[PDB]
């Protein structure tokens, strides 16, 4: 009786409409992928043979549950299969499946049970098959998922005062540290915005280094925002931008707000794309920064192809595409930087985004590019000389590769889904400490559920443990009963047989 | 020097840890005892960079009587400009 | 798996009922005699647990075997009648005690559920062969009694030495499959059964 831990599919609700699987109780047999009834039976598929047509057939057959045995290494898997699992994910996720779906990890006993289930499912012959019918029944633990109603989505915010004056423009940079995949407990999210927020930390360090010294204390208020509630329609940004605009009258989100950068999945890859909701106006700070960025990317580092992406704001999509969209909604200059090119790509989320998928060299180079562009635009350097054919960050300010790698490793160390990173988890605590060492006015915004037309209601029971109980049908046991009955008849004869044998001697 | 450096360990072991800055010349007189507390990141106040071999002995409060562990030790002779010591702490028993 | 629990119970208890009805229970109405034998068996089990606490595996097994043999001898002296029938009144009581012991309670707590381990049916088989094991034990007890001649003390000492055969076979299997181990125990127990019946046909005189 194996006792493994099965991670369910997402069960979040947004704006009142549900999403993902909506069930967390199963007690059925384990009938893997076969031409049998497959109804009211747990279906076992392996990632190596998990076809979408098969999955849609499974869903149409109203299975009791679906369990996927992810490969244990999850890195030695061929990259093409990885691409297929990337391509299957957005379509798989966007549904209201009412049947629990659990994802497991390869195990010796798990492989054995999968093999046995495959043998029994696929397959004198009828009675022999009934006699050797070792088909296990899988049951889960706990109760159905309940809407966790008192989850405070966190958000870490820090400021950076300019040099002198109360009207300094306040550039704001955000990155949602969280990342949800098709499995919240498996959503490490390394190449996703967990890799843009990492660059933000180095920028935080670097800009702290830049602001710490008087001679480099630029006159530009900087509001950094390690937002929570990211791929979840950017709720953390929604609530934060709301609280600093309509609730209060203070805060820099009203003073002289310049362009608001947002960083996500800006890691691996040789192409950089700056997505915009609306084209930058020529002459403004956004346009000036874009010119600096193009000059740098054309002069400093020619190895990356760069191109703006101008996606018009769409108020029909489930999510607000990039993150700068929520900022541009509140008449605030913003744009998102990413190594990706299309928002429609299911390259985000991506539980497949293991740590080994974000190259450290690309991260250092991307950080160099962005930070140097920001430095040039902030310090009025463009109208100061400084040709873009030579960098700022050579020594004494070099982007710490070790720091970037270690931070990324730590980030990937644990799942970063918004429903599992508590508002006081050690992950958040370590992040806040790291940010506190570099920023000013660091705090933690929280969004509960709005308690009216719930913007989001996370559910629980995501890391359930499932039992593989051995069992055989009653027909086998009836056959065993017939065998023992024959033996008992023999026993009835044996008494007189032994009496006669003793008499004979 | 602006020292830094994360720590790789389980969450529950974090409050019972204090990273050290044992100077190389004397390993019995620590010069910094930043407690990790609840954050997997120590940010030792900036030091000067001139040789100065140091130690980062991870001095936990957890005794061997109920758990088995080995405290890491890192030397980072101060000649550079930053550091991201990445102590990995996985006690047993 | 309640019906499996039913099948295992049918395998274990029913042969006991068969022996009860095929051994002339009405000859003495052995319910009281069986109860006395069972009380003695429980007492012997208590004595063995106390002795094990007082006093590696061989010493405990020897103490348990000695206590069981002593209890059987006392129980046998407690009643008078047919030699085959005292054999029965001793063996049946002790065997019912063994089934009622920790070879029925696990069958209740286990089984009847969702899990299926062959252990329960194997235990029922072993309990059924325990019937003939206690038959052998009763034969040894009767041989100790029923007068003394014809190298009888040598055979009695050999039979006493052969007791605790279960522990010896268990140790061998531990040093050495479950179905294979059960089969080996079955064959050795059958060998002791045939040795005891050979002794019986030798002693009938």
Swiss-Prot record, chain A:
Glycosylation site list: 193, 380
Stretches in topological domain Lumenal: 1-474
UniProt entry keywords in alphabetical sequence: Endoplasmic reticulum, Glycoprotein, Membrane, Signal, Transmembrane, Transmembrane helix
Annotated InterPro entries: Nicalin, Peptidase_M28
Summary of the tissues where the protein is detected: Highly expressed in pancreas and skeletal muscle and, at lower levels, in heart.
Record's keyword annotation contains Iron-sulfur: no
GO molecular function terms listed in the Swiss-Prot or TrEMBL record: ribosome binding
Gene Ontology cellular component terms for the protein in this record: endoplasmic reticulum membrane; membrane; multi-pass translocon complex; protein-containing complex
Family stated for the protein in its record: Belongs to the nicastrin family.
Subunit and partners: Component of the back of Sec61 (BOS) complex, composed of NCLN/Nicalin, NOMO (NOMO1, NOMO2 or NOMO3) and TMEM147. The BOS complex is part of the multi-pass translocon (MPT) complex, composed of three subcomplexes, the GEL complex (composed of RAB5IF/OPTI and TMCO1), the BOS complex (composed of NCLN/Nicalin, NOMO and TMEM147) and the PAT complex (composed of WDR83OS/Asterix and CCDC47). The MPT complex associates with the SEC61 complex.
Name used for this protein in its record: BOS complex subunit NCLN
Curated annotation (Swiss-Prot), chain B:
Protein name, as recorded: BOS complex subunit NOMO2
Free-text tissue specificity from the UniProt record: Highly expressed in pancreas and skeletal muscle and, at lower levels, in heart.
Described function: Component of the multi-pass translocon (MPT) complex that mediates insertion of multi-pass membrane proteins into the lipid bilayer of membranes. The MPT complex takes over after the SEC61 complex: following membrane insertion of the first few transmembrane segments of proteins by the SEC61 complex, the MPT complex occludes the lateral gate of the SEC61 complex to promote insertion of subsequent transmembrane regions.
Residues of the full protein shown: 1057 to 1149 of 1267
Taxonomic superkingdom: Eukaryota
Subunit structure: Component of the back of Sec61 (BOS) complex, composed of NCLN/Nicalin, NOMO (NOMO1, NOMO2 or NOMO3) and TMEM147. The BOS complex is part of the multi-pass translocon (MPT) complex, composed of three subcomplexes, the GEL complex (composed of RAB5IF/OPTI and TMCO1), the BOS complex (composed of NCLN/Nicalin, NOMO and TMEM147) and the PAT complex (composed of WDR83OS/Asterix and CCDC47). The MPT complex associates with the SEC61 complex. Due to the strong similarity between NOMO1, NOMO2 and NOMO3, similar interaction pattern probably occur for the three gene copies.
Subcellular compartments: Endoplasmic reticulum membrane
UniProtKB/Swiss-Prot annotation, chain C:
Outcome after substituting residue 121 to N: In NEDFLPH; decreased stability
InterPro entries hit by this protein: TMEM147 (IPR019164)
Recorded topology in the membrane: Multi-pass membrane protein
Entry keyword annotation includes Protein biosynthesis: no
Spans traversing the lipid bilayer: 1-20, 34-55, 56-76, 87-112, 118-143, 151-173, 179-200
Keyword Ion transport: no
GO BP field: multi-pass transmembrane protein insertion into ER membrane; protein localization to nuclear inner membrane
GO molecular function: ribosome binding
Main localization, broad class: endoplasmic reticulum
Residue intervals annotated with topology Lumenal: 113-117, 174-178
Mutagenesis / variant outcome for changing residue 6 to R: In NEDFLPH; decreased stability
Residue spans, topological domain Cytoplasmic: 21-33, 77-86, 144-150, 201-205
Cell compartments where the protein resides: Endoplasmic reticulum membrane; Nucleus membrane; Cell membrane
Keywords in alphabetical order: Cell membrane, Disease variant, Endoplasmic reticulum, Intellectual disability, Membrane, Nucleus, Transmembrane, Transmembrane helix
GO cellular component: endoplasmic reticulum membrane; multi-pass translocon complex; nuclear membrane; plasma membrane; protein-containing complex
Family from the record: Belongs to the TMEM147 family.
Function, as annotated: Component of the multi-pass translocon (MPT) complex that mediates insertion of multi-pass membrane proteins into the lipid bilayer of membranes. The MPT complex takes over after the SEC61 complex: following membrane insertion of the first few transmembrane segments of proteins by the SEC61 complex, the MPT complex occludes the lateral gate of the SEC61 complex to promote insertion of subsequent transmembrane regions. Also acts as a negative regulator of CHRM3 function, most likely by interfering with its trafficking to the cell membrane.
The protein, known as: BOS complex subunit TMEM147
Organism name: Homo sapiens (Human)
């Amino acid at each position: 009786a194996h006792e493994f831990t099965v991670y369910r599919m997402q069960q979040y609700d947004l704006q009142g409409q549900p999403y993902g699987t909506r069930n967390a109780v199963l007690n059925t047999e384990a009938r893997t992928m076969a031409a049998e009834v497959l109804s009211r039976r747990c279906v076992l598929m392996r990632l190596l043979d998990f076809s979408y047509e098969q999955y849609q057939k499974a869903l149409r057959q109203s299975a009791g549950a679906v369990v996927i045995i992810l490969p244990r290494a999850m890195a030695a898997v061929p990259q093409d299969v990885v691409r297929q699992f990337m391509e299957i994910e957005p379509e798989m996720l966007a549904m209201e499946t009412a049947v629990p779906v659990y994802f497991a990890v390869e195990d010796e006993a798990l492989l054995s049970i999968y093999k046995q289930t495959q043998a029994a499912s696929a397959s004198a012959e009828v009675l022999l098959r009934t006699a050797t019918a070792n088909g296990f029944q899988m049951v889960t633990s706990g109760v159905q998922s309940k809407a966790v109603s008192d989850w405070l989505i966190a958000s870490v915010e820090g400021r950076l005062t300019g040099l002198g004056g109360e009207d300094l423009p306040t550039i704001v940079i955000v990155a949602h540290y969280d990342a949800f995949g098709v499995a919240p407990w498996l959503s490490l999210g390394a190449d996703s915005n967990g890799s843009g927020v990492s660059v933000l930390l180095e920028l935080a360090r670097l800009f702290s280094r830049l602001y710490t010294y008087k001679r480099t204390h630029a006159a530009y208020n900087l509001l950094f925002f390690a937002s929570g509630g990211g791929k979840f329609n950017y709720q953390g940004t929604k609530r934060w931008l709301e609280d600093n605009l309509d609730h209060t009258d203070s805060s820099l989100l009203q003073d002289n707000v310049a362009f608001v950068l947002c960083l996500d999945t800006v890691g691996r890859g040789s192409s950089l794309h700056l997505h915009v909701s609306k084209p930058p106006r020529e002459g403004t700070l956004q346009h000036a920064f874009l010119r600096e960025l193009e000059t740098v990317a054309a002069h400093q580092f020619p190895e990356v192809r760069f191109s703006m992406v101008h996606k018009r704001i769409n108020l029909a999509e489930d999510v607000l595409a990039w993150e700068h969209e929520r900022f541009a909604i509140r008449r605030l200059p913003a744009f998102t930087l990413s190594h990706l090119e299309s928002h429609r790509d299911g390259q985000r989320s991506s539980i497949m985004d293991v740590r080994s998928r974000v190259d450290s060299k690309t991260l250092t180079r991307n950080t160099r590019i962005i930070a140097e562009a920001l430095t040039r635009v902030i310090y009025n350097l463009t109208e100061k000389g400084t040709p873009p054919d030579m960098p700022v960050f050579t020594e004494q300010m070099q982007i710490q590769q070790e720091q970037l790698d270690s931070v990324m490793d730590w980030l990937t160390n644990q799942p970063r889904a918004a429903q599992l990173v508590d508002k006081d988890s050690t992950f958040l605590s370590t992040l806040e400490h790291h940010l506190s060492r570099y920023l000013k006015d660091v705090k933690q915004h929280h969004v509960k559920a709005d308690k009216r037309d719930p913007e989001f209601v996370f559910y629980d029971q995501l890391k359930q443990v499932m039992n593989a109980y051995r069992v055989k049908p009653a027909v086998f046991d009836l056959l065993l009963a017939v065998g023992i009955a024959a033996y008992l008849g023999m026993a009835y004869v044996a008494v007189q047989h032994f009496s006669l044998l003793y008499k004979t001697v | 020097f602006d020292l830094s450096g994360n720590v790789i360990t389980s969450s529950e072991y974090l409050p019972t840890l204090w990273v050290k800055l044992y100077k190389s010349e004397n390993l019995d007189n620590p010069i910094q005892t930043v407690s990790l507390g609840q954050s997997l990141f120590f940010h030792f106040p900036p030091l000067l960079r001139d040789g100065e071999n140091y130690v980062v002995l991870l001095d936990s409060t957890l005794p061997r009587s109920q758990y088995d562990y080995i405290l890491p030790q890192v030397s980072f002779t101060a000649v550079g400009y930053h550091k991201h010591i990445t102590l990995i702490f996985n006690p047993t028993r | 798996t309640l019906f499996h629990f039913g099948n295992c119970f049918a395998l274990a208890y029913f042969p006991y009922f068969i022996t009860y009805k095929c051994s002339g229970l009405s000859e003495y109405n052995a319910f009281w005699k069986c109860v006395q034998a069972g009380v003695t068996y429980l007492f012997v089990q208590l004595c063995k647990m106390l002795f094990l606490a007082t006093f590696i595996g061989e010493f405990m097994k020897a103490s348990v075997d000695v206590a069981d043999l002593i209890g059987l001898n006392l129980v046998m002296s407690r009643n008078a009648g047919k030699g085959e029938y005292k054999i029965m009144v001793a063996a049946l009581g002790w065997a019912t005690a063994e089934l009622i012991m920790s070879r029925c309670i696990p069958l209740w707590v286990g089984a009847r559920g969702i899990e299926f381990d062959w252990k329960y049916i194997q235990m029922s088989i072993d309990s059924n062969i325990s019937l003939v094991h206690y038959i052998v034990a009763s034969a040894q007890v009767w041989m100790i009694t029923r007068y003394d001649h014809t190298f009888r003390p040598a055979v009695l000492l050999l039979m006493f030495l052969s007791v605790y055969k279960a522990f010896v076979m268990e140790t061998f299997v531990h040093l050495c499959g479950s179905w294979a181990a059960l089969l080996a125990r079955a064959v050795v127990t059958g060998l002791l059964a045939l040795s005891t019946l050979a002794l019986y046909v030798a002693v009938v005189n």
